[PDB]
Write a protein that binds this ligand. Structure first.
Ligand SMILES: O=C(O)CCCC[C@@H]1SC[C@@H]2NC(=O)N[C@@H]21
Ligand SMILES: O=C(O)CCCC[C@@H]1SC[C@@H]2NC(=O)N[C@@H]21
Lengths: 322, 322
């Protein structure tokens, strides 16, 4: 409805306290009896609101839907993001982001419940079902030379890992350069792209897909043995609005780190985090395909690999399989 | 009008021959007497059409307006470009291009008679008056690593130079890395940007502004001593549709060269072309500003400079003043 969001906003801003139909009706400037329709609807949409007589309304729990109104609260308190955009379904949050960044310098992010044409690295299909995962592109505006994309990718990786870790009983590791794993289920994939030129970057557009609320039965086939959600490694229910909040919090931390520190400082931690050593790796390079071993990550973000034929390579990027 | 373009198309396709109101009327499937309005209008818009009784209509000369219909002919015969877009006025042909490239792989270009918000390097204002200059962004899809932007810039430079040269009595030189000069008037500036990621470029978007039909009196102030048009170095009238045709022809040649040759091969020619040696240069780098001498362009597109304090720099890019 026309007013739904503003209602949800007031409801949210007012926790841990109740507020009266009355009090809402004065703010939004609409009938006491319209606020009831709006509420009776929000509940029907799966909202948990406690309504008690004489006292009013308290927002208890939100469903697995993103609401522009409440996501406005995050953008508001943010010291990073100007605005956000929220859709229930779009073609792709990266495509949207790439459109929205032109002729302005805003930092911002875009969430969508469902993607109908979401892609990953190399333009692989990316599965993005309604109400199941956080599908989001983020735009930032670092003031750096274009060479520095690679580092961003590494820092953010730890942001996305921690955010996810704080919610997982099992250990969450990073599979360089782009994937986040819990055990041998890929929980999230992310991708960093830039608009840039000869001297200075115009924007960064990091697209992030994390699987939130998936049962084993939801995946297939046969990805079911190398894909896992967050929920499947957390005894208690996973709150999408709570995860968002830490994810954004960590994305920020790691952005600033990126902005003020050379990699070396992060390096040793990134190692503790990676699950690529002491196992055979499966590298692809256009027509060519080979095996090899991850030996080390050097100070510049590059991966030092020993291919099965004994030769040493120093790689900026790669796509790797277990 | 609704049909104007299709008329102009037939008119153009039929040179050096006349064609009858009749013959047009059958193709476009409209009254013989509507074709007359369309023609009487095209003339009034500054078209030169010869109409003789019993014989018909011949397209003699086009004004200083771009027409989507005739520009369709170039895109059609092209072995490079899928389509084009033509506007009489837009915000910026780069902005437009950056929007139009998303979620597709088309190669294409965009022309506009006037820009209301056209920018150059570092987001400097770029003057783009109606009917006076070729204002165009071009999109290509090379299949190369993102590092290779720099080279593209160098090759295209010679394309844009030759295209312009064939029309100038005075010698046309390239001021590395982005400007085209005739004597000490900047005739054109161009800029190469990319959308790309860790492994592979998504698109190139080279934006090109060349001054076509400017009198000294049109410029100011006081750019009038370091800016010059093409027309001011050509005794005979400059045809915007004829220049476009060679420009596109050269852009293509030089693109293919880029695609199949290392720089070294172009290098020595690029030198004959540059007007940066044996004079003092004025380099800017963020807060810092210094003098120096252009000593050489090495095989990798980099400029070897000797700053006034005797130190040697190897530069990928720079902004330079005379
Ligand atoms: O291929 C991968 O390794 C990761 C793909 C990352 C996809 C995310 S989902 C949200 C955003 N929208 C997209 O189109 N892609 C990113
Ligand atoms: O600053 C320079 O040195 C050159 C500027 C190049 C501007 C051209 S004009 C057509 C296209 N549209 C733009 O916004 N810029 C390029």
């Amino acid at each position: 409805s026309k007013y739904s969001q503003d209602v949800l906003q007031l409801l949210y801003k007012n926790k841990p306290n109740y507020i009266s139909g009355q009090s809402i009706a004065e703010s939004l400037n609409i009938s006491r009896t319209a606020v009831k329709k709006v509420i009776d609807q929000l509940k029907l949409e799966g909202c948990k609101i406690d309504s008690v007589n004489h006292k009013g309304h308290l927002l208890q729990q939100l469903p697995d839907i993103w609401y522009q109104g409440i996501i406005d609260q995050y953008t508001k308190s943010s010291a990073l993001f100007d605005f956000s955009e929220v859709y229930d379904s779009i073609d792709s949050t990266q495509l949207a982001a790439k459109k929205s960044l032109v002729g302005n310098q805003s930092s911002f992010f875009i969430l969508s419940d469902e993607q109908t044409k979401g892609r990953g690295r190399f333009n692989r299909h990316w599965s993005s079902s309604k109400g199941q995962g956080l599908w989001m592109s983020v735009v930032l505006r670092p003031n750096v030379a274009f060479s520095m994309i690679s580092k961003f990718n590494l820092f953010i990786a730890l942001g996305i890992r921690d955010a996810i870790q704080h919610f997982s009983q099992d250990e969450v590791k990073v599979k360089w350069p782009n994937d986040i794993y819990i055990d041998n289920g890929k929980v999230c994939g992310f991708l960093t792209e830039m608009v840039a030129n000869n001297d200075g970057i115009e924007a960064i557009i990091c697209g992030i897909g994390i699987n939130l609320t998936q049962q084993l039965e939801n995946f297939d086939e046969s990805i079911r043995h190398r894909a896992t959600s967050i929920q499947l490694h957390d005894k208690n229910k996973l709150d999408r609005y709570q995860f968002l909040e830490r994810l954004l919090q960590e994305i920020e931390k790691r952005y600033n780190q990126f902005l003020t520190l050379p990699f070396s400082e992060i390096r040793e931690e990134y190692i503790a985090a990676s699950n690529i050593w002491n196992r055979t790796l499966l590298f692809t390079e256009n027509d060519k395909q080979f095996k090899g071993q991850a030996i080390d990550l050097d100070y510049d973000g590059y991966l030092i690999v020993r291919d099965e034929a004994g030769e040493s390579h120093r790689l900026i990027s790669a796509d790797i399989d277990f």
